Write a protein that binds this ligand. Sequence first.
Ligand code: HEM
Ligand SMILES: Nc1ncnc2ccccc12
Length: 289
Amino acid sequence: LVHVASVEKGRSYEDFQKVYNAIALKLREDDEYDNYIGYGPVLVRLAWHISGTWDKHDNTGGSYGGTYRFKKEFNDPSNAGLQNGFKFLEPIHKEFPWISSGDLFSLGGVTAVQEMQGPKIPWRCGRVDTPEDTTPDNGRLPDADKDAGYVRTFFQRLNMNDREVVALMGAHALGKTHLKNSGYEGGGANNVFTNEFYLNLLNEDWKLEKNDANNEQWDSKSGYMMLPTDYSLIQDPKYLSIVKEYANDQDKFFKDFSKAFEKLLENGITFPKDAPSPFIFKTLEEQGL
Ligand code: HEM
Ligand SMILES: Nc1ncnc2ccccc12
């Protein structure tokens, strides 16, 4: 099953930079959301969930088909809360109705990471909306109650190795868990992209507690939290070495996250040899906007 990227007709870098800028302006404008976290973190999570349905074995799921717009995937229990990111992107899609759904959801993640001071993430256009019958069934996104072996095996389906898994999980510096969405609570209110997930794993005094939904999670007196799957990155000796590497090298973490995140957003897509090169969008700050 082959999904060939097809550039939206006549569009080029400038058109996508306009979409980027509308997303970024709205991120700056709509600042009250989720106790003043703003929409950055939920847009990063949306981009990952629309991508993380991919199965390398048969090329089902993945970001190409924009299938999150269909009720089966919109209503996936694993996606609870992402409706806020979808609603955020609705006026962007209205303004730019030519962009495909998969392009818009993945570009919403790139724009959020960059606007939150994260690394540049090269991004390629050309995902093409596919019909409702192509929507992947629920249950392809990962559980949070599990251990390192589960996380390792899970991510083999997405063709991610240990370093890619540890780098991608660094996005859990951002935003927070919400008891009503996932049965976990807490994390604070961070909306700046840094390597602090790894510093918090290594440096905080973690206690295994039960939350009000009767699920275990690791909490610190300082008010931080880690899901069991987060904490597993310091329980497994291979993951731990990489957590220490990223805790000690911001640039390395930025570069590795950028590559893994682009890869995640592009899994399943065949780019023609004459496709445009990946675009690197300028931030609003770089543009003086
Ligand atoms: C083992 C893999 C993962 C598990 C089990 C997991 C689990 C979760 C859970 C339970 C939440 C809270 C949802 C809520 O209550 O609103 C969450 C939030 C989030 N996740 Fe993950 N996640 C994983 C991997 C990732 C990856 C790979 C990324 C992106 C690279 C990511 C980005 C985020 C972001 C940015 C949030 C915050 C959303 C917000 O503040 O609304 N996650 N994740
Ligand atoms: N802020 C977070 N800290 C640690 N783990 C997480 C997991 C999901 C969302 C946010 C966080």
